[PDB]
Design an enzyme around this catalytic site. Structure first.
Site, short mmCIF file in Angstrom:
data_model
loop_
_atom_site.label_atom_id
_atom_site.label_comp_id
_atom_site.label_asym_id
_atom_site.label_seq_id
_atom_site.Cartn_x
_atom_site.Cartn_y
_atom_site.Cartn_z
N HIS A 67 -2.92 11.82 -18.75
CA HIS A 67 -3.58 12.91 -19.47
C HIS A 67 -2.60 13.90 -20.07
CE1 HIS A 67 -3.79 15.19 -15.42
NE2 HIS A 67 -3.45 16.17 -16.24
N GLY B 132 -0.53 23.01 -13.48
CA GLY B 132 0.80 22.50 -13.69
C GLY B 132 1.32 21.58 -12.59
N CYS C 282 0.01 18.56 -11.61
CA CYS C 282 -0.22 17.15 -11.84
C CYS C 282 1.08 16.40 -12.03
CB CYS C 282 -1.11 16.93 -13.04
SG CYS C 282 -2.81 17.38 -12.65
C1 LIG Z 1 -2.96 18.96 -13.51
O1 LIG Z 1 -3.00 18.68 -14.90
C2 LIG Z 1 -4.23 19.67 -13.07
C3 LIG Z 1 -4.17 20.08 -11.59
C4 LIG Z 1 -5.31 20.98 -11.15
C5 LIG Z 1 -5.31 22.36 -11.81
C6 LIG Z 1 -5.84 23.30 -10.74
N1 LIG Z 1 -5.52 22.60 -9.50
C7 LIG Z 1 -5.29 21.29 -9.67
O2 LIG Z 1 -5.08 20.47 -8.76
N2 LIG Z 1 -5.38 18.81 -13.30
C8 LIG Z 1 -6.40 19.12 -14.12
O3 LIG Z 1 -6.47 20.18 -14.74
C9 LIG Z 1 -7.49 18.06 -14.27
C10 LIG Z 1 -7.21 17.25 -15.54
C11 LIG Z 1 -8.26 16.19 -15.87
C12 LIG Z 1 -7.87 15.44 -17.13
C13 LIG Z 1 -8.45 15.23 -14.72
N3 LIG Z 1 -8.82 18.62 -14.31
C14 LIG Z 1 -9.53 18.83 -13.18
O4 LIG Z 1 -9.07 18.80 -12.06
O5 LIG Z 1 -10.80 19.11 -13.49
C15 LIG Z 1 -11.72 19.19 -12.36
C16 LIG Z 1 -13.01 18.49 -12.71
C17 LIG Z 1 -13.54 19.11 -14.00
C18 LIG Z 1 -12.73 17.01 -12.94
S1 LIG Z 1 -14.28 18.67 -11.43
C19 LIG Z 1 -14.44 20.37 -11.08
N4 LIG Z 1 -13.44 21.04 -10.47
C20 LIG Z 1 -13.86 22.34 -10.30
C21 LIG Z 1 -13.23 23.46 -9.76
C22 LIG Z 1 -13.95 24.63 -9.75
C23 LIG Z 1 -15.25 24.69 -10.26
C24 LIG Z 1 -15.87 23.58 -10.80
C25 LIG Z 1 -15.16 22.39 -10.82
N5 LIG Z 1 -15.53 21.12 -11.28
#
Ligand SMILES: *[C@@H](O)[C@H](C[C@@H]1CCNC1=O)NC(=O)[C@H](CC(C)C)NC(=O)OCC(C)(C)Sc1nc2ccccc2[nH]1
Lengths: 299, 298
Positions: A39, A141, A143
């Site tokens: 990603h 950051g 990932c």
């Molecule tokens: C690294 O790029 C990053 C690491 C995350 C950032 C905050 N803590 C971490 O571990 N990953 C992402 O941003 C990641 C990227 C996608 C392309 C997989 N996105 C992510 O983790 O999104 C979470 C979901 C939308 C998949 S599910 C979710 N998570 C939350 C948290 C709070 C409220 C609602 C919610 N829905």
């Protein structure tokens, strides 16, 4: 008993950063390849609904900025393997350890080297939950941070970080880019399933308690694996596999307590409770120490 | 999660030090190896060692120092309190930027547990109010060090020397002065009564809120002194105004005044947890500082 991580230096020597546009995450540099979450090739808006094959075909080697510290590593090749990007670079990492890529099972523990902009910040120990999440500690950051075990001088890489879920737990892939659990690298609502207790680790903990002279809970009975498995599931405990029985072997030999006898003692703790007592000082049964963790620390 | 500093900068300094039939770890910085002085004792010496008398009877060649597969030649030695200093004929090229610091009780640090000069594990510990640490150390772990990292600089604060009957551990700073009233002689030694590190419990409660768990909060407040009266009753350390100030950033982030959180902790102390857990723990955790929480939660 402490959560105790592996020394992180061999993995620190493999961390880099990878940037595409303004999207920066961490990568793992082993020999002349850098591994990172695919990603990185997404704009934040692409992440809502990416078509990775189409996004990648528009990329060239010269769109990838790989840096060890401030030093650019030139990319000479790229390919996608499941949810990981492999960037061939023109320099073999002189700090490459002996290594392998392994896919772990739920209950197995590993150390995570949390990194930001290719710079290590911290190390801690995690257990892969039965629902294929880990109770990590990750910020924006992070990932591409990896999880690993070290067996002798060989680093076994088992985890690369991709995602934080609503309950605050974390999801990611092995180093071949296959997610643990049902998750996808898309910015769309996802959730961890209901978690369960890691039975094999609880048994390891009971063995640890016996090794340390705390054995009130040893009962007189035994059970079959099938009977135990059917009972344990009623308490939201995982069933045991044959591999679980086998990795309890050394602790069973060390204590002289057959695995199935220990299962019967745990069954009685489940069905009757602690009745006010403690084990290793705790009224709670611990499920994030594997049989190997127990030996590492009692060794 | 209880998070340690990356240990690589320290791993590049660990060596093995043997004298007689005794083997433990040393810390190799520039051309000097630091290790516990009790390496020079026999079994009989450990009972009551006159270290100055025992050391003067030793020669450089009685010290076998091994860095991996290479023996380092000891070309001189001195003693500083409970640490032996071996001068070697080689500079450690992996020497990081470093300082030696003496930490205060309640402060945390990472431990790189080592055996025979080889790193085995890394974990986070706190200097207890009674100057012990609750570590995981086995035979051969002496000379393992505790440290913090700021920017690229390693601040060494602990070298491991002993285990007490209760299973906790004692050691020195890198000047060889013990933390606590302990002595590097082979005698059973008890520690003073321990207490709970209150400012750290409060940091951890804020962490629990930052991560969405607030079942333990309540609508009440307290004064600093009335809180401290209750804290001391339960063998908690007193909270100082500097402690209140250090908790500022966490108070701001959550919108929960420190004395409000003190009132919540007072209720937990008097009522217990009633079966509930906080951040997975059935017990109040006191080995995260305000800084630890802030760094990991931002
Ligand atoms: C690294 O790029 C990053 C690491 C995350 C950032 C905050 N803590 C971490 O571990 N990953 C992402 O941003 C990641 C990227 C996608 C392309 C997989 N996105 C992510 O983790 O999104 C979470 C979901 C939308 C998949 S599910 C979710 N998570 C939350 C948290 C709070 C409220 C609602 C919610 N829905």
């Amino acid at each position: 008993f402490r959560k105790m991580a592996f020394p992180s230096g061999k993995v620190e020597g493999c961390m880099v950063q990878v940037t595409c546009g303004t999207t920066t995450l961490n990568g793992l540099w082993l020999d002349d390849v850098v591994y990172c979450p695919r990603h990185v090739i997404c704009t934040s808006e692409d992440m809502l609904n990416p078509n990775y094959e189409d996004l990648l075909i528009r990329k060239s080697n010269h769109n990838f900025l790989v840096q060890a510290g401030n030093v650019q590593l030139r990319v000479i090749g790229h390919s996608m393997q499941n949810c990981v990007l492999k960037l061939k670079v023109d320099t073999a990492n002189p700090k490459t350890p002996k290594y392998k890529f392994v896919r772990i099972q739920p209950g197995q523990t590993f150390s995570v080297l949390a990194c930001y902009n290719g710079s290590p910040s911290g190390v801690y120990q995690c257990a892969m939950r039965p629902n294929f999440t880990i109770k990590g500690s990750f910020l924006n950051g992070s990932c591409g941070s990896v999880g690993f075990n070290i067996d002798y001088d060989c680093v076994s890489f088992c985890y690369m970080h991709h995602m934080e879920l609503p309950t605050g737990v974390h999801a990611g892939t092995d180093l071949e880019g296959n997610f643990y659990g049902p998750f996808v690298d898309r910015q769309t609502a996802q959730a961890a399933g209901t978690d369960t207790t890691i039975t094999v680790n609880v048994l390891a903990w009971l063995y640890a308690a016996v090794i340390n002279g705390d054995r009130w809970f040893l009962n007189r009975f035994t059970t079959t694996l099938n009977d135990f498995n059917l009972v344990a599931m009623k308490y939201n405990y995982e069933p045991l596999t044959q591999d679980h029985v086998d990795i309890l072997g050394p602790l069973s030999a060390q204590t002289g307590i057959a695995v199935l006898d220990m299962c019967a003692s745990l069954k009685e703790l489940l069905q009757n409770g602690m009745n006010g007592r403690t084990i290793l000082g705790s009224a709670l049964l611990e499920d994030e120490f594997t049989p190997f963790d127990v030996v590492r620390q009692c060794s």
